[PDB]
Design a protein around this nucleic acid. Structure first.
Ligand code: MG
Ligand code: MG
Ligand code: MG
Ligand code: MG
Ligand code: MG
Ligand code: MG
Ligand code: MG
Ligand code: MG
Ligand code: MG
Ligand code: MG
Ligand code: MG
Ligand code: MG
Ligand code: MG
Ligand code: MG
Ligand code: MG
Ligand code: MG
Ligand code: MG
Ligand code: MG
Ligand code: MG
Ligand code: MG
Ligand code: MG
Ligand code: MG
Ligand code: MG
Ligand code: MG
Ligand code: MG
Ligand code: MG
Ligand code: MG
Ligand code: MG
Ligand code: MG
Ligand code: MG
Ligand code: MG
Ligand code: MG
Ligand code: MG
Ligand code: MG
Ligand code: MG
Ligand code: MG
Ligand code: MG
Ligand code: MG
Ligand code: MG
Ligand code: MG
Ligand code: MG
Ligand code: MG
Ligand code: MG
Ligand code: MG
Lengths: 118, 221, 48, 120, 116
RNA sequence: GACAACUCUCUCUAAGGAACUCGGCAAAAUAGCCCCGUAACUUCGGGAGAAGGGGUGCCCCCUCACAAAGGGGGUCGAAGU
RNA sequence: UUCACAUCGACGGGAAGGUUUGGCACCUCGAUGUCGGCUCUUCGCCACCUGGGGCUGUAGUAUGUUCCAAGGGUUGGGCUG
RNA sequence: CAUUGAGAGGACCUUUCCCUAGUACGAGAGGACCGGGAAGGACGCACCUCUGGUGUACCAGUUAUCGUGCCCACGGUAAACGCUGGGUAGCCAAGUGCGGAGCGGAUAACUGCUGAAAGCAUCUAAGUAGUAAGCCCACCCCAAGAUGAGUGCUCUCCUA
RNA sequence: AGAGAAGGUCACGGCGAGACGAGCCGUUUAUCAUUACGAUAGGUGUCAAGUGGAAGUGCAGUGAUGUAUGCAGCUGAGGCAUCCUAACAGACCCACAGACUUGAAC
């Protein structure tokens, strides 16, 4: 039988994630994880950037599933979002995991610097 | 109006993203297709004074149709269908009834396309949302906050000008989005992917036809 | 505001007949409800 | 998202501490500005015994914004402050050293600032 | 406009909605048949089916929810005793609505609601 | 009953923070108790709660509870008058 | 630089327009509510910018003066009621 | 049901940079017309995949007090959330896409070609060609109450 | 006069349509399958998603409390299945082959 029209969103959403997973698997990430991301930069060719920090959110949106990474560089706080299933991301690690009690760590924007330094 | 080519009709299903090989993101809109996309009638200048062709869509149960509409479709031996729209052209020498219209034969890849459908109905809205008027002060004793203000000069002219931008119904009408790039085709699922937004919510009808440009495709005047 | 002058006699009536015209549509609903109730077949309306 | 009367920090070794934007440059009749946009600014706090005085009018470019900067690959950048770097007409900074990270989008207009930065 | 908003307002704030519907279920589950308006009856189907769904999974965690919802204490203890034998096979649709003539004072469309 | 504009009575509002405006009008913020520390000027009475900072929950012990306060230790939360 | 008319043009003259200050006191005294500002328009050209030309004491860039042209556009602030 | 479009409206806006080219010009400084290609501004038509606001559907934390016999656990109130921390759909912009095209027509100012009256000359009182963000059409929406009420396909008009 | 043409309106169940009217979808829910039409709303089941680790019990601790059972528990305005309840009853308007002239056909 064919595919019903009310389900095509899930199929395309499920199909792309399956292709990206076999091409590049990804572990299970939750709020509070401390990760280390390696992503290709088409501007240069030789090396790749290395961004790390604590996960302060995880928005589930299918193929465009995101994670926000807070980390303090050069004394100033910096929050960056990363789509998990992008082809630019070459490698992800999970260094450790902090104990938390919420889904989104927005309070750290007002807390001290040491809570986000790495 | 005169169209540059022949289009079809589909239904909005939703909206999502599309990751390229290099990694660029593309906000893409999805459009499905029901069963029926068959031609119903062919018009000519000898009969109607203009050249065009009808197209039906969204097959349904026969009992739901009015009996006049049945005879219109039963002439060409065509299944029952709900909607009907035309596509005006310059020449219709290569079209007949009972003819299917596959979109992949007409829209291959990266082709600009003019989407058209019904917008979201906002209802009886004011001037700030409809006509983008500015707002009055919220403090300093002002009584008028979201009102229009003056609607005329005074004794001269002595009446309100016609077509004055005033409240009323907003949305729910027909629009057309021009020059949208097609990203990908998928004949397995019978679905098409187009960059950008589309008027309406999922389940809404629309027509997509080749992009018409003034001096290139259509006859100038 | 305030009216400049008084409404005439027949312009008044034309506006009253519209108010009365609503009774025409209310009577049809009642007749449809009775004939749809004097048969004892509707299981969605308890009249007692 | 830098409106006039906005108090900005200083990232370079120019010898200033705070600025106040009054106008925008490059964008015709625009009122806001993102990273990479040039602005006219007014000093409000300066370092003692430095070439820059307290109430000078200067040109500068935004390097950090608390508003989010979107990229093409879905990545987004966000800072926890608003800052800028003074410049000349050519666009080179007066300060010899730079603080804070800089985005890679400035290389097309301001490559000198990208080089002097500690990180990117 | 209310596009995508599925909620019965009943011309009352939230504190009164949460009490009005909560109070009618106490009367229906003990009487089995009441006379109310049609707007109140339509909003009632969502909550009566919830309490009946708790009785199918007649556990202790599911009982404490009904006690917080249902005002009186004896009906909840009596509700779980009879529903598994009465609705041991039905899957949803635990009530019907029968229309009725309106009232004399305000022409409010009235209707009965009962448990199948 | 319904849940359009618009008005009034209320809540929140990204980035910026008086650029509004005749005018910071209005709104917002501050707030209690216990400690630390409090200027010019002065009719020596005041100024003064000046300003400006720290602490604040719950549990155990010190402790004999001495009605208190204080000290030590532990623990929950983004946030303890 | 010589050359009245590239650009200014004294001395005087002839006009249009109805936005200035005024003259007259014709409508309104059993009422035609004011200055400025906010909001929201809409027309006119005697053209500030944008389009297209002529002349130049226009090399070029940039102007200057003037013709067609009113389609569109004509910022945010400090002081002041 | 599908439609022609008399008429009507909306929108056709604009800056900078690069290439041509440090070329033409000019002693040198300095620095192009035309043409082409990018990035913006403002405005407009849409959209919620993305980033977020709100979200008195919902989830969680917590102060005081009343009640459910009491502990545990829950509920009510602290206007129209007790105060806060998050939030799907929806709505929304700060967010996301698109838009402004024409070597099409006729002109204004101006430049002209051919060439009389006037054996010369003259852009013209015959004829004709270039050419403006302007005018008309084309682009987008409405539209036969356009009483000038249109056009086309299909259907129905039973019984005595 | 009888009877109810096409078709329209009310009524019944609803909406990404809407001030009210209007407009749109649906009104016994199919059977066959290489195939698309017969699930409107609510409920139920399931999934995405949101919040972020329920109750009870056991363990550790003098205790506050922590910890295991446990991606738990709750929610699920959304998607897909499922006729479980309600679209029952039915009502009104409506059917002169389209006057008269002229021409060409017949
Ligand atoms: Mg998101
Ligand atoms: Mg609407
Ligand atoms: Mg304003
Ligand atoms: Mg007010
Ligand atoms: Mg008049
Ligand atoms: Mg000074
Ligand atoms: Mg009321
Ligand atoms: Mg309350
Ligand atoms: Mg704000
Ligand atoms: Mg001002
Ligand atoms: Mg001011
Ligand atoms: Mg005040
Ligand atoms: Mg206050
Ligand atoms: Mg003090
Ligand atoms: Mg003082
Ligand atoms: Mg005058
Ligand atoms: Mg005068
Ligand atoms: Mg009078
Ligand atoms: Mg002029
Ligand atoms: Mg026309
Ligand atoms: Mg027009
Ligand atoms: Mg969104
Ligand atoms: Mg969404
Ligand atoms: Mg939202
Ligand atoms: Mg008690
Ligand atoms: Mg409570
Ligand atoms: Mg309580
Ligand atoms: Mg009480
Ligand atoms: Mg109350
Ligand atoms: Mg309140
Ligand atoms: Mg929020
Ligand atoms: Mg909240
Ligand atoms: Mg000649
Ligand atoms: Mg000659
Ligand atoms: Mg001539
Ligand atoms: Mg033109
Ligand atoms: Mg009939
Ligand atoms: Mg109707
Ligand atoms: Mg259902
Ligand atoms: Mg989940
Ligand atoms: Mg537990
Ligand atoms: Mg969950
Ligand atoms: Mg569901
Ligand atoms: Mg079935």
């Amino acid at each position: 039988q064919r595919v019903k029209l009310g389900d095509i969103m899930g199929i395309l959403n499920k199909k792309a994630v399956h292709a990206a997973e076999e091409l590049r698997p990804v572990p299970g990430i939750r709020t509070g994880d401390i990760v280390q991301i390696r992503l290709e930069v088409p501007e240069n060719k030789r090396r790749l950037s290395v961004y790390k920090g604590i996960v302060i959110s995880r928005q589930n949106a299918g193929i465009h599933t995101t994670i926000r990474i807070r980390r303090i560089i050069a004394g100033v706080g910096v929050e960056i979002v990363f789509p998990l299933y992008s082809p630019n991301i070459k490698e992800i690690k999970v260094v450790s995991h902090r104990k938390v009690r919420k889904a989104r760590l927005y309070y750290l924007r007002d807390k001290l610097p040491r809570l986000s330094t790495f | 109006s005169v169209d540059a080519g022949i289009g079809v009709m589909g239904t909005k299903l939703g909206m999502m993203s599309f990751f390229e090989e290099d990694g660029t993101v593309v906000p893409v809109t999805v459009i499905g297709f029901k069963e029926g996309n068959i031609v119903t009638q062919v018009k000519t200048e000898s009969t109607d004074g203009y050249n065009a062709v009808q197209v039906g869509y969204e097959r349904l149960r026969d009992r739901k149709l009015t009996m006049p509409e049945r005879g219109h479709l039963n002439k060409a031996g065509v299944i029952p269908m709900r909607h009907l729209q035309e596509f005006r052209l310059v020449s219709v020498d290569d079209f007949t009834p009972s003819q299917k219209l596959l979109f992949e034969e007409l829209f291959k890849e990266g082709d600009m396309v003019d989407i058209s459908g019904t917008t979201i109905g906002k209802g009886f809205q004011g001037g700030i949302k409809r006509h983008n008027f500015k707002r009055g002060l919220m403090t300093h004793g002002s009584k008028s906050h979201r009102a229009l203000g003056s609607i005329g000069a005074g004794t001269t002219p002595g009446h309100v000008y016609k077509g004055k931008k005033m409240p009323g119904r907003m949305g729910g009408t027909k629009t057309k989005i021009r020059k949208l790039k097609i990203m990908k085709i998928d004949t397995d699922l019978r679905v098409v992917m187009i960059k950008g937004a589309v008027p309406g919510k999922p389940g809404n009808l629309l027509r997509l036809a080749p992009a018409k440009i003034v001096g290139k495709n259509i006859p100038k005047n | 505001a305030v009216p400049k002058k008084r409404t005439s006699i027949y312009k008044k009536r034309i506006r009253k007949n519209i108010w009365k015209k609503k009774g025409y549509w209310a009577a049809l609903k009642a007749f449809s409800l009775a004939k749809s109730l004097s048969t004892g077949n509707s299981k969605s309306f308890f009249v007692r | 998202m830098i409106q006039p009367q906005t108090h900005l920090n200083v990232a370079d070794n120019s010898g200033a501490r705070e600025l106040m934007c009054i106008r925008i440059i490059g964008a015709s009749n625009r009122r806001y500005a993102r990273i990479g946009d040039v602005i006219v600014a007014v000093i409000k706090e300066a370092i003692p015994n430095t070439p820059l005085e307290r109430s000078e009018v200067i040109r500068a470019v935004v390097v950090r914004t608390c508003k989010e900067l979107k990229r093409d690959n879905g990545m987004i950048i966000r800072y926890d402050d608003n800052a800028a770097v003074i410049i000349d007409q050519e666009g080179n900074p007066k300060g010899t050293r730079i603080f804070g990270a800089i985005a890679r989008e400035l290389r097309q207009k301001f490559a000198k600032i990208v080089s002097l930065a500690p990180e990117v | 406009m209310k596009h995508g908003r599925k909620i019965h307002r009943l011309s009352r704030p939230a504190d009164q909605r949460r009490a009005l519907l909560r109070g009618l279920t106490t009367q229906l589950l003990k009487h089995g048949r009441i006379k109310t308006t049609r707007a109140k009856a339509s909003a009632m189907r969502k909550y009566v089916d919830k309490m009946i769904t708790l009785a199918k999974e007649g556990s202790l965690h599911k009982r404490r929810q009904a006690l917080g919802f249902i005002y009186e204490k004896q009906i909840v203890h009596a509700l779980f005793a009879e529903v598994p034998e009465r609705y041991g096979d039905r899957n949803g649709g635990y009530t019907r609505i029968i229309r009725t003539l309106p009232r004399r004072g305000d022409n409010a469309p009235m209707a009965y609601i009962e448990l199948v």
